[PDB]
Amino acid sequence: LPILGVLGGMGPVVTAEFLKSIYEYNPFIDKEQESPNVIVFSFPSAPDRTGSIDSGKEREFIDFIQVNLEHLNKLADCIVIGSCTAHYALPQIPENLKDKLISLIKIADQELQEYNEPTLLLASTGTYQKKLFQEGCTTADLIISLSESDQKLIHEMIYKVLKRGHDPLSILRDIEALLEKYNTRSYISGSTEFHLLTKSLKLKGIDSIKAIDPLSTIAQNFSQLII
Amino acid sequence: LPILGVLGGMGPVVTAEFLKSIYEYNPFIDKEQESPNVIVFSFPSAPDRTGSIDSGKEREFIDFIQVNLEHLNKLADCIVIGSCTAHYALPQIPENLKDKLISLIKIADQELQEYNEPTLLLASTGTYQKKLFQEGCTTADLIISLSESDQKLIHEMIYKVLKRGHDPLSILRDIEALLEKYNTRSYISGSTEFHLLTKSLKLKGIDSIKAIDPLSTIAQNFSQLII
Ligand SMILES: N[C@H](CCC(=O)O)C(=O)O
Numbered sequence: 127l128p129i130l131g132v133l134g135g136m137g138p139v140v141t142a143e144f145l146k147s148i149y150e151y152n153p154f155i156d157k158e159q160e161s162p163n164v165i166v167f168s169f170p171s172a173p174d175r176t177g178s179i180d181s182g183k184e185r186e187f188i189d190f191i192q193v194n195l196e197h198l199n200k201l202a203d204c205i206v207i208g209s210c211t212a213h214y215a216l217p218q219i220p221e222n223l224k225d226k227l228i229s230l231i232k233i234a235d236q237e238l239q240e241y242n243e244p245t246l247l248l249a250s251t252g253t254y255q256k257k258l259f260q261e262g263c264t265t266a267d268l269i270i271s272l273s274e275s276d277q278k279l280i281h282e283m284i285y286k287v288l289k290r291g292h293d294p295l296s297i298l299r300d301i302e303a304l305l306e307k308y309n310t311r312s313y314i315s316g317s318t319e320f321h322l323l324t325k326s327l328k329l330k331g332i333d334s335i336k337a338i339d340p341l342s343t344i345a346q347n348f349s350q351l352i353i
Numbered sequence: 354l355p356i357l358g359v360l361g362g363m364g365p366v367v368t369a370e371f372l373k374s375i376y377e378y379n380p381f382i383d384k385e386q387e388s389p390n391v392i393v394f395s396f397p398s399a400p401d402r403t404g405s406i407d408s409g410k411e412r413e414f415i416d417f418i419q420v421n422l423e424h425l426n427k428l429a430d431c432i433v434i435g436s437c438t439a440h441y442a443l444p445q446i447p448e449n450l451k452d453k454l455i456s457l458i459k460i461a462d463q464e465l466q467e468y469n470e471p472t473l474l475l476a477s478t479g480t481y482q483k484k485l486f487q488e489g490c491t492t493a494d495l496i497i498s499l500s501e502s503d504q505k506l507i508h509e510m511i512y513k514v515l516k517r518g519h520d521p522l523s524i525l526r527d528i529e530a531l532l533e534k535y536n537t538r539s540y541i542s543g544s545t546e547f548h549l550l551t552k553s554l555k556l557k558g559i560d561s562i563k564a565i566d567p568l569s570t571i572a573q574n575f576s577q578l579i580i
Pocket residue numbers: 136137174175176208209210211212249250253316317318319
């Protein structure tokens with residue numbers, strides 16, 4: 127049977143929620159044995175991703191990701207890293223250790239190609255600094271970058287609210303305002319933590335916003351994506 | 354740092370919820386790196402636990418648990434199996450592979466010793482058949498066994514409602530009735546799936562019921578229990 131390996135904990139809250147999603151969106155028909163087999167390394171003690179860029183110690187972090195990928199390659203058929211900013215370590219990893227990997231950037235890029243309207247990239251300043259989406263996406267011109275002012279306002283929301291486990295709906299008003307400002311009905315979860323907002327939005331049947339959320343897509347299309 | 358290993362998927366829904374609990378009850382103060390490091394093997398394709406007792410094939414199931422314990426012993430400092438009925442395989446496992454293990458039966462037994470009033474054991478017929486709680490607990494006389502009629506009614510709730518992911522509150526009325534019938538204000542989660550009820554109960558501030566729920570206890574007392 128096919129096994130997804132999640133290198134998570136770079137949002138312990140969101141890693142927990144991601145696994146909930148996997149079974150929410152793949153309910154069994156008769157028996158539980160039908161349902162997805164998953165492995166989760168939820169290690170919060172990964173060095174802070176943006177903070178490791180802001181100080182000198184990017185090597186400490188790349189070493190973390192590399193070691194845990196070697197583990198997961200032995201155990202899982204496909205692999206996902208539970209953090210967009212964490213993808214910056216990938217150019218420094220051996221190509222062989224990334225055969226099973228599923229880039230959250232690539233999953234967003236595909237979704238955005240099909241959606242085909244301008245969309246607001248919500249992400250941590252460290253994701254922005256590394257330009258992971260602008261450098262990684264075929265659809266990079268459809269991405270609307272936040273101004274530096276608003277990148278910090280988003281960094282606030284992620285760390286102060288979402289990662290702490292507070293009600294994702296609490297920032298909904300602030301996001302609707304941003305979507306209005308930059309003049310769009312859609313956003314990209316350029317910070318996996320916005321998986322928590324996407325779920326809260328879908329719960330209340332709020333259809334006005336189109337979320338391009340890689341974790342939601344990986345969950346929903348598990349059966350197709352995992353071989 | 355200390356690592357909990359969860360052999361889960363014997364309730365994929367509840368395994369997902371258990372990991373959510375771990376971070377709900379251990380929120381970080383300053384930084385995420387503080388938060389618990391956890392590994393989860395959520396493998397629903399474990400043979401049905403009660404069904405493996407009801408047919409001949411208990412060896413197929415014990416082999417499953419044994420293989421995955423060998424894996425987890427190499428990776429985690431403490432280990433938890435996410436299913437009470439699954440604990441029946443333990444007498445057939447080597448003693449060495451169970452040093453790191455934390456019996457859900459033992460955790461319930463301790464909690465019940467401190468609570469010290471009669472308490473209704475809610476569990477699958479397969480747990481009951483194997484007498485895991487009556488044979489495993491120092492406090493076995495404080496346990497109130499369900500009648501065979503009500504064991505099937507509980508088996509219904511677990512498989513039809515809880516494992517499918519339906520609102521645990523939907524069975525609250527049926528449980529209050531059972532608690533009244535057997536004349537007690539408390540229950541034991543003899544089926545890890547009742548972790549889902551305990552959480553839903555705590556959410557609505559329903560204090561009338563005292564839940565002895567091993568997963569909730571392991572979550573809340575993570576820092577103390579994991580070395
Ligand atoms: N969560 C990462 C950024 C912060 C982190 O590494 O946890 C993301 O947006 O994908």
